[PDB]
Structures are given as C-alpha cells and as structure tokens.
Amino acid sequence: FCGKGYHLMSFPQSAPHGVVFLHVTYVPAQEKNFTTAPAICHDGKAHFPREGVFVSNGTHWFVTQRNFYEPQIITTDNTFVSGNCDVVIGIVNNTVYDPLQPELDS
Amino acid sequence: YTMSLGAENSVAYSNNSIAIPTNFTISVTTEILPVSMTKTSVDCTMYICG
Amino acid sequence: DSTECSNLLLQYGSFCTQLNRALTGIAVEQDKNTQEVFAQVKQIYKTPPIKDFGGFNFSQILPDPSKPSKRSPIEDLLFNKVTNGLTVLPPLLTDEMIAQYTSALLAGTITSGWTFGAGPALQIPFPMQMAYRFNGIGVTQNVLYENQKLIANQFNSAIGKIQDSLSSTP
Numbered sequence: 001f002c003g004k005g006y007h008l009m010s011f012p013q014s015a016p017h018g019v020v021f022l023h024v025t026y027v028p029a030q031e032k033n034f035t036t037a038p039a040i041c042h043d044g045k046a047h048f049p050r051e052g053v054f055v056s057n058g059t060h061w062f063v064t065q066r067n068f069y070e071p072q073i074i075t076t077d078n079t080f081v082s083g084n085c086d087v088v089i090g091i092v093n094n095t096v097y098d099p100l101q102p103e104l105d106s
Numbered sequence: 107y108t109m110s111l112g113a114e115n116s117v118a119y120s121n122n123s124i125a126i127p128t129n130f131t132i133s134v135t136t137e138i139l140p141v142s143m144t145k146t147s148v149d150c151t152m153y154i155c156g
Numbered sequence: 157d158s159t160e161c162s163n164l165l166l167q168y169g170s171f172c173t174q175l176n177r178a179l180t181g182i183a184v185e186q187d188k189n190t191q192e193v194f195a196q197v198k199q200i201y202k203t204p205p206i207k208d209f210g211g212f213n214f215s216q217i218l219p220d221p222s223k224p225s226k227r228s229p230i231e232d233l234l235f236n237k238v239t240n241g242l243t244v245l246p247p248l249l250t251d252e253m254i255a256q257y258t259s260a261l262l263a264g265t266i267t268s269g270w271t272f273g274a275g276p277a278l279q280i281p282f283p284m285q286m287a288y289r290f291n292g293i294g295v296t297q298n299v300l301y302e303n304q305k306l307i308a309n310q311f312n313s314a315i316g317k318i319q320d321s322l323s324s325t326p
C-alpha cells in the first residue's frame with residue numbers, strides 16, 4: 001500500500017493536479033542460508049523463541065530476529081518452555097544457557 | 107515474440123533450511139496519484155446559440 | 157457499405173471518433189486491470205519437486221502436470237463452470253500465463269512466506285511459516301507445533317470441502 005518492501009515512512013509532494021508520495025521502505029538484502037529447527041530440546045523440555053527464530057551455521061545453534069541476522073546465545077530469557085520434546089516434530093537437541101547459573105556457581 | 111512473464115527463480119525449499127537477511131537497503135519509490143481536474147464551466151445558452 | 161449514409165454521417169462530426177476512443181480506453185483498461193491484479197511479482201517461482209510441507213497438501217491448488225493447460229484442479233473446475241462492425245480483441249495475457257502468474261504467487265507464498273512480496277524470496281519451512289502466521293494473530297508458536305498434524309488435516313479437509321462446494325453449487 002505504501003511502496004514495495006516493508007514500509008517505514010512516506011513524504012508528500014505537491015504536483016500539478018496531483019500528489020507524489022515518496023515511500024521510504026526497508027528491503028532485506030544479502031540473505032544467507034541457515035539450518036533451522038522449530039524448537040530446542042533441553043532437560044526434557046521444549047524451548048520456543050519468544051520473538052525470533054532458531055538458526056544454525058553448521059555446528060552451533062543461536063536465536064536471531066526474523067528480519068535481520070543477529071545471532072544471540074539461546075538462553076531462558078529469549079525462549080519459553082511449553083511441553084516436553086515428544087510432541088514437536090523436528091525438535092533438535094541443544095543446550096540452553098542460564099544466566100543465573102554462574103551466579104549460584106560462584 | 108511471446109512475452110516472458112519474469113526471470114525464472116526456483117526457491118531452494120527444504121524442510122529444515124531458512125534464509126535470513128544480513129543487510130538491508132533503504133529504498134525510496136515514487137507513487138503518482140491524480141487528485142483534481144481542471145474546473146470547467148460551460149454557458150449552455152452561449153455555447154449552443156451565442 | 158452505404159456511401160450516402162457515410163456522407164450524411166460526416167455532417168455530425170467526430171462522434172464516431174469519440175465512441176472509438178472510449179471503447180479503446182475501456183479495452184486497454186481491461187489489460188491494465190489484469191496487469192495490476194496478477195502481475196505483482198517479477199520472478200516466476202516454482203515449488204520443489206518433493207511436496208514435503210509437513211503434512212500440508214496443496215495438490216488441489218498447485219498446477220496439474222497431467223493437464224495440457226497447466227491449471228490446478230480448482231482452476232480447471234472454475235474454467236469448466238464458466239460458459240456489423242463488432243470485433244472482440246483478445247486479452248493481452250492468455251489464460252495460461254495468468255495461471256502461470258497464480259502458480260508463481262502460490263509457490264512464493266508456500267516456499268517463502270511473505271518475504272517474496274517485500275523483497276527477495278527467503279525460503280522458510282512451511283510449519284514455521286504457519287507458526288509465524290499464528291504469532292501474527294496472537295497465538296503462541298507452541299500451539300501450532302504441538303497440533304501440527306490436526307491443523308494439516310483440517311486444512312486438507314477444508315480444501316477438499318472447497319472443491320466439493322464449488323463442484324456442487326451452480
């Protein structure tokens with residue numbers, strides 16, 4: 001409706017008997033392949049991303065936002081737990097880091 | 107010639123692979139929309155008969 | 157072919173030119189309408205040869221290779237259910253190319269989500285695309301993943317009911 005791509009903002013310009021809209025939009029570029037999974041199996045529990053998506057560069061699993069590649073460590077703060085690992089089709093095994101773990105470790 | 111609808115592009119679909127963008131382009135596009143016309147009035151008596 | 161009639165018709169001026177120009181405008185407007193509706197992608201996408209979409213069946217909407225017209229069964233049913241100076245101009249886009257455009261749109265929305273409409277087509281698994289759509293309507297991803305078989309069965313049943321309802325209603 002407001003240009004091709006993900007619309008950010010627009011500018012109006014007067015024209016003889018008309019209007020010209022300059023649509024400023026966000027276009028994704030330089031995409032890269034990653035190996036993805038619906039959920040992460042850890043401690044007999046299924047972890048799902050709160051807002052992002054699980055990606056793998058070949059050996060390590062990360063969670064990133066869907067529209068830009070920004071890999072972050074899979075923790076309990078960016079994932080939520082629902083059910084065990086027996087129901088979700090395609091769940092993979094990976095560790096889930098806990099930020100609280102070094103606090104009681106020390 | 108018979109027209110080509112578009113350049114062929116086969117998306118590499120598989121059940122466990124995703125494509126994530128690593129960059130972006132800020133694209134500005136133009137959209138021209140007419141708003142009004144010339145306001146014309148015709149004197150019917152003068153036009154037909156003068 | 158009456159020359160006296162045309163000689164008398166020339167007294168009325170450019171009425172015929174106005175009528176021809178209006179009809180020409182309508183005729184190009186129809187092609188513009190088809191261009192705006194169907195030609196919204198400049199890449200012709202195709203589905204993979206293996207139709208593994210996590211239990212989701214799209215055979216009723218994907219093109220049938222057995223048919224020479226390359227139409228879907230639903231599109232084939234839709235085409236079956238529709239039955240002095242005059243000329244009929246052919247449409248600029250044939251039915252085969254409009255079917256090809258719909259096939260490209262279906263392949264893009266199945267294999268790439270909504271990414272192809274906003275930029276380059278980024279591949280994503282279909283049970284993940286569905287989960288994204290679930291998150292769009294405010295339902296958590298887990299609900300989709302846990303009940304993926306039931307949702308796929310319901311979707312296939314609904315698509316079959318659509319074909320049956322179109323085939324059974326005049």
Ligand SMILES: *[C@@H]1O[C@H](CO)[C@@H](O[C@@H]2O[C@H](CO)[C@@H](O)[C@H](O)[C@H]2NC(C)=O)[C@H](O)[C@H]1NC(C)=O
Nearest residue numbers: 034055056057058059060061062070071072073
């Ligand atoms: C996937 O990304 C991870 C994290 O960026 C990579 O792990 C790093 O690999 C480099 C190269 O040997 C090491 O120096 C770093 O110490 C590693 N970091 C961690 C946290 O282990 C991993 O190698 C990448 N895999 C591929 C196939 O590119």
Ligand SMILES: *[C@@H]1O[C@H](CO)[C@@H](O[C@@H]2O[C@H](CO)[C@@H](O)[C@H](O)[C@H]2NC(C)=O)[C@H](O)[C@H]1NC(C)=O
Nearest residue numbers: 041042043044045084085086090091092093094
């Ligand atoms: C992911 O981890 C689970 C849990 O350890 C693995 O499930 C085990 O699979 C072995 C091999 O068949 C069985 O003998 C165990 O009894 C299973 N344990 C449970 C709790 O189900 C699963 O195989 C692992 N997946 C991968 C790909 O390594």
Ligand SMILES: *[C@@H]1O[C@H](CO)[C@@H](O[C@@H]2O[C@H](CO)[C@@H](O)[C@H](O)[C@H]2NC(C)=O)[C@H](O)[C@H]1NC(C)=O
Nearest residue numbers: 030031032033034116117118119123125126204
């Ligand atoms: C992600 O991986 C796929 C599979 O290797 C890549 O798709 C191939 O791209 C080459 C380059 O033109 C084609 O010749 C192959 O036919 C493609 N394979 C299939 C199955 O279509 C894809 O290009 C990769 N994506 C990125 C961004 O590198």
Ligand SMILES: *[C@@H]1O[C@H](CO)[C@@H](O[C@@H]2O[C@H](CO)[C@@H](O)[C@H](O)[C@H]2NC(C)=O)[C@H](O)[C@H]1NC(C)=O
Nearest residue numbers: 028029030031032069127128129130131132133
């Ligand atoms: C993202 O794309 C931008 C292009 O808009 C890249 O910026 C260019 O980077 C090259 C490499 O140093 C420079 O020579 C160009 O002058 C840059 N262009 C502009 C407009 O700044 C940017 O590097 C890309 N980033 C990544 C991570 O790929």
Ligand SMILES: *[C@@H]1O[C@H](CO)[C@@H](O[C@@H]2O[C@H](CO)[C@@H](O)[C@H](O)[C@H]2NC(C)=O)[C@H](O)[C@H]1NC(C)=O
Nearest residue numbers: 207208209211212213214215216229312315316
């Ligand atoms: C997808 O749906 C199609 C049609 O609903 C299935 O095709 C049917 O398969 C059965 C079993 O072989 C046949 O008896 C029917 O005649 C087929 N219908 C048609 C219209 O051809 C297909 O099996 C489903 N699954 C897959 C994986 O394609």
Ligand SMILES: *[C@@H]1O[C@H](CO)[C@@H](O)[C@H](O)[C@H]1NC(C)=O
Nearest residue numbers: 037089090091121122208210
């Ligand atoms: C993807 O398909 C392969 C078979 O080609 C299967 O072994 C694998 O488990 C599937 N993965 C998912 C996540 O469905």
